[PDB]
Design a protein around this ligand. Structure first.
Ligand SMILES: *[C@@H](CO)[C@@H](O)[C@H](O)[C@H](O)[C@H](O)COP(=O)(O)O
Ligand SMILES: *[C@@H](CO)[C@@H](O)[C@H](O)[C@H](O)[C@H](O)COP(=O)(O)O
Ligand SMILES: *[C@@H](CO)[C@@H](O)[C@H](O)[C@H](O)[C@H](O)COP(=O)(O)O
Ligand SMILES: *[C@@H](CO)[C@@H](O)[C@H](O)[C@H](O)[C@H](O)COP(=O)(O)O
Ligand SMILES: *[C@@H](CO)[C@@H](O)[C@H](O)[C@H](O)[C@H](O)COP(=O)(O)O
Ligand SMILES: *[C@@H](CO)[C@@H](O)[C@H](O)[C@H](O)[C@H](O)COP(=O)(O)O
Ligand SMILES: *[C@@H](CO)[C@@H](O)[C@H](O)[C@H](O)[C@H](O)COP(=O)(O)O
Ligand SMILES: *[C@@H](CO)[C@@H](O)[C@H](O)[C@H](O)[C@H](O)COP(=O)(O)O
Lengths: 223, 223, 223, 223, 223, 223, 223, 223
């Protein structure tokens, strides 16, 4: 399972990349507009992320119409080979995906909330589909159930579109995505940070340290 | 999973095709006779649909006897290479399918209401079999259970006949079909139009628009 | 399981009532506005339904504010002992339900789309809660799963609020509701009339009639 | 589980009753017409069955309209206290059941093919409901599944209507009915006979006889 | 669960009774005729067993006809109040059980090999029914499945006939019977003797003995 | 799944073969003796069946000893390449199968009633094994369970012997065989006929005809 | 599934072999010592079995120490290419297995009572592992559950050691072994002879014989 | 499944290695510090284990920082080609594993307590991952459940990292690990010695010994 960071915060991205556990990044218009403040321009932020991240970086078109989406998608693609164009699940978006796929431009279909929307995005040729699990949780439906159905559907038809689980809110969305077999999860920085941690890891390290001091006062291993 | 449009309404078909989410069309004598009124000839409607739709178009014979079925099937076939001949599940129909298969004319067995009828159609060599789910729901039996059994049976015997789920009434028929792994669903236009939609997609788009205006008052993405 | 008719059409109601299979009626502002045309007044329609139907008749408030909802509710109550006041799942709506419940005015919480909304309506003291199954089906979620969870939750806490399944679209919503154990379904007229029918019933009657004529020419049963 | 005999053959009835394994009888117009041959009159057949059988005896009305059904039902009821009036699952039928129930006349609703038909009959106050399992098997649906759902539904609502499984064709219909918990099965004579039998019973008897001869040449137990 | 000994061997019975784990005895013509050799009379064996065993003792009739069965049953009954009359699952046997039940003579229906035979025996009023599990195992059917179905059926109808599992061949028949909830098992002596035993019991006792010698060389507990 | 006809009635065979739905025929000595009446000779009946039927035709030996079975088998095989020799599950039978398999003569082991009998037949090299499901139903055991276990066993060991389900009594035996994945079912003619039929097929045909009349009074499809 | 005979009785072996259903033989020191009486020598018994049986013949070492076990093993090996050396699950036994496996001497690890013992024997390279099911049943644990776990473990790791189920007591140990997919069962003679038998086989043959005599007086099948 | 010894005690290791059932060894700072007392040096202990164990020997770094971990790892590697470097699940540990993997130095990530930690370790390229089951049991969660999830996740993504189950406390941890399909278990010496043993193995050997003495007074097997 690939793990992407879901943020436009450059400090977060630099930190996660330096950890070597980040395989790519997703952004969206809300995340970008959050960071583009106090003199920061959205063009600069987008370019900076593309440069810092080796892996896929998803950037969302803002046009709602086919022609505008395709024009923006081409500009996004032009910014770097790792750029992936994020396109919403709408009639115009499916049309844009089909055109862009034929032009060999990688795509990510977003704002997906049920398995049939996901199947339609796959049929348009999309590179990644992003169902939102937290926003479903918000409205009282267990969002992970949709991921499970999408995985079964895609398995049934040998679909090559990757499942990129989005709107992740906690480490159990991550755990359940891996057990289901989603291709990618994209996670906010707080969640990413949590993933490596467990109290028994800390406790075990402390005990090893203490026991080793018994035989090596300076705590060294000399071989 | 292929998605066909189940109508003879030329306006619906043009619209669906332009959406890019329609892989073929199914008709039947009721659908066609509904459209062929106030001057419109059934022969013209059939030809127009064949012209408009790139993918398979199912057209049903009206003869109840073997010889008449085959004679009608050949005429249907001659109207275009994308024509598929719809034949009912009857003794004469099974005979006609067998003959037509040997002539390399694609066939679609219809009015199937249990898994054994579907198996018989596959044994006759039919290209598609169309179990009806809504008409079973109508009489108090969950039609989707028949689809589930047909998929299992076809899997068991590595049967190449495609399952083309028909009498679809709602988007859950479509969802359950995809999870089962049916090859094709054919849907009325009202159902088709609902498949792309979800209130959280609309809501997320509105929020993205609003947030983006904060960094680009005119609402565009200049890269 | 009680069976209510979901309509404001007097002809449908008179017909279903005379069939003996209708235990009550649910209306809403859309259904009533459909009928209040060609000079028919909504006030007359409502009173007429109350008169024809011996069982519960739900009638929806139109105000969105607490004070207006309880004013309208008391007026609805004043129309007949069988009136039930339909109130939407909103903050004001729950406050209204709590007040009316204490006043011993029967209530029906509507526009419920998940089990926790249903629980909140029950906690406010509502007489009936109406989850909408068809409108969930519309958006690609199997609405019956919400009925199943609500039944489990209500069982857990011995909740006395009745589950009144609404937005019913077909006879399998009705079947599944009965197997789950919902207290009430409310169904459109087209669904109601289908519930008694089965082709093997018709076939079986025809055969019995024919056999009997073999021993009683006139077809009589003289005892 | 009560076991009824499904026949109008007087000889079978006498034999079954004398085996002591028969709790009642069901007839229908086909079964009776079969016996009312060569001078035998249907009215005499019906009266003799009521006489020979201590348990319930189902006799079906032939009229298809409400007034005729109620008139014939009252006549059937007048023939003896053990008479039960068989009424078909129709609009008129349900009305007749309601009326007759209020007159304390026992009823059996017949020609039921799904669980919602059975529920409607129960709601009309019917004494017994008779779903047909063999005729469902005939059309490629496992009829025992309908009995299972009806049992669950009736359990949910504490329904007092008895499930009387009909159209029984083999001993596994009987076994499955008992495991589900149906109130009554009605069986043809040939099925009835087979229920007492097993090759290991016969084999064990033969062996006990042979072994006992060794200790008692005359094969008696003298105590 | 009661545990009966399935033998006519008086030595086995005395031994089992002295162990305190035998609640009753079952015999049959094969078991008795096995013991009644070289002078020993079957009448004496039966009387001795009735004297030795406090609990129920099943003794089988040898007549195959109703009148002979009942005459033998009454003689068996007169030998002692703890006698239970074993009657085979046949038409004549069901008749005899019914008569004997009305006379307050306890009965045990034997040679039962499926759940419907067991139900018929319960319907005749039998005190115990004895399905055979080993003889089913002999012919390639898992006999315990029949016990499981009988328990479910008897539970469904609140049947008071006790399930007395017979033809027991090993301790897992006994374990599975207890987990299912059979009322009684009847076991051959070899199986009986194994039930108390386990290698870890012996091993734990040996260790306890050894450890105790360390604080009390003579091996006693002085308190 | 292949469908064979289980009959020696020449008229049924001709009819079934001409429906095009029959892949072979099974006979046995009872079926043949039924036809060999009024001058008709068994040898002529067998030869005619081999002639009319292109697929396998099972003909049963009557000898009970190894030498007689092998002699009769060779004669049956000599009558035509499509002849398959039916051999009973006995000690001599298994030996005959082994010999005949080494002689490249196709075999069908019959009178199988449990899964281990079926495995032994497969180990002897038999071409088809025929468990009897109806005769198990007769004695109160669901015969389809044996087919399920045999399928699992044969899958485990990659056994090439084909499962040919026999003693079929109804269309649910057929449905369950297909869902399990049995290689072949052999069915009586009356069952065969019922497999193509469904009341909703007939009803849908009638409706298509009526609707088409509106657009074509003569009910033809002129293209 | 292979079927071996678990005995040292030459008469039983000759008989089972001549039946054609015995694929090999297992012995042990108890079985051999039973037979080596009245002047019969164990050395002659073993060589005689090796001669009669074409398949694997397991013969158990009596030494408890590594050196003795490999010495005896090599001598057993020297008796015939079909000899298999049975070695118990002990520390010395595993060492012996590892040595012999490298010497290409076939081995059978015996006295296995749980799945981890079976895994250790496999890891030592053993040809066959023999878990004991009956001796577990003796102590109140269902021994077949251990076979199921061993099959799962061996599947997980693609282990080539064959599972050779031993301490078989009845035909359901054999049935369950086949459904689980054990490679081999070894069975006592009394169990072997029961595997071919079923009362409905005998009953069916008798009926076929009678019917045939109706058309062939002599009972011949002349073709 | 590979079985390693989890200890730094040379006597235990020498013993297990002599038994032939130990495939490798794991150590940790606590285990080593335990043995390195009363003059024993940790350097000698580590080298000694490397010398006598043919298979993988895991040795843990003590540094908590990336540079120290990588340096200590290279030193461990240099001690022998069977050394595996144990590295804790921390940020600097994952970085170290990635570097060491690129240097073709085998690694074992330790102190793993949930499946997502295990996944991150795999993503870093670790050779083995070691989730701790006993320490989870300690804090009241069944640690084997984490092993099951890790197996499923690794299967989903065809991950080549081996699951090395650690903190093993009893033989049921070993059994469950094998049933799940873990690649390796590492076990304390007390657990290891218990794996070969079972009381029925001992009892069976004693009986075989006793019986053989009947045929061979000196207890030998002469062939
Ligand atoms: C792109 C893939 O769709 C990604 O940035 C998504 O847009 C975000 O994961 C969601 O919008 C986050 O929503 P949430 O409601 O904050 O969890
Ligand atoms: C052809 C079969 O592939 C297709 O047009 C079917 O005839 C229709 O789907 C059904 O007739 C539609 O029936 P419904 O009762 O309207 O749902
Ligand atoms: C009242 C709730 O008991 C009832 O009238 C509901 O308002 C209706 O059942 C729904 O509004 C019907 O919606 P649909 O989308 O037409 O199925
Ligand atoms: C009455 C219902 O209690 C009963 O006589 C039923 O009418 C019969 O069981 C069925 O008509 C029998 O039909 P089948 O198709 O012969 O099985
Ligand atoms: C009486 C029934 O309660 C009892 O003695 C039974 O007759 C026996 O348990 C069986 O006959 C024993 O048969 P098996 O074939 O020896 O196991
Ligand atoms: C042969 C097996 O392939 C086949 O003819 C069988 O003999 C028959 O199916 C059975 O004998 C039919 O028995 P039933 O009891 O009539 O169902
Ligand atoms: C060898 C293992 O393949 C085999 O002879 C076994 O030793 C026997 O199957 C058992 O010893 C038989 O024990 P039981 O307790 O008589 O069933
Ligand atoms: C190393 C593999 O990670 C191995 O030595 C582990 O460190 C041990 O298995 C555990 O530390 C043992 O802990 P426990 O709490 O004693 O069971």
């Amino acid at each position: 399972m690939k793990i992407f960071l879901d943020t436009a915060n450059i400090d977060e991205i630099r930190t996660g990349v330096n950890w070597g556990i980040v395989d790519g990044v997703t952004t969206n218009p809300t995340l970008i507009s959050k960071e583009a403040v106090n003199g920061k321009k959205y063009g600069d932020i987008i370019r900076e992320i593309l440069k810092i991240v080796d892996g896929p970086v998803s950037v969302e078109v803002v046009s709602t119409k086919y022609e505008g989406m395709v024009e923006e998608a081409r500009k996004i693609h032009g910014l770097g080979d790792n750029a992936v164009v994020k396109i919403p699940m709408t009639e115009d978006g499916l049309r844009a995906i089909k055109t862009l796929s034929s032009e060999h431009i990688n795509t990510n279909c977003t704002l997906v909330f049920n398995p049939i929307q996901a199947l339609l995005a796959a049929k348009a040729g999309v590179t990644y589909v992003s169902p939102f699990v937290g926003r479903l949780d918000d409205i009282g439906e267990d969002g992970m159930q949709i991921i499970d159905m999408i995985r079964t559907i895609f398995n049934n038809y040998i679909i090559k579109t990757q499942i990129l689980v989005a709107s992740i809110r906690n480490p159990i969305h991550v755990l359940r995505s891996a057990v289901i077999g989603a291709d990618v999860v994209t996670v906010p920085f707080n969640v990413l940070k949590s993933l490596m941690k467990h109290p028994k890891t800390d406790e075990g390290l402390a005990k090893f340290l203490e026991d080793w001091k018994k035989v090596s006062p300076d705590g060294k291993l000399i071989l």
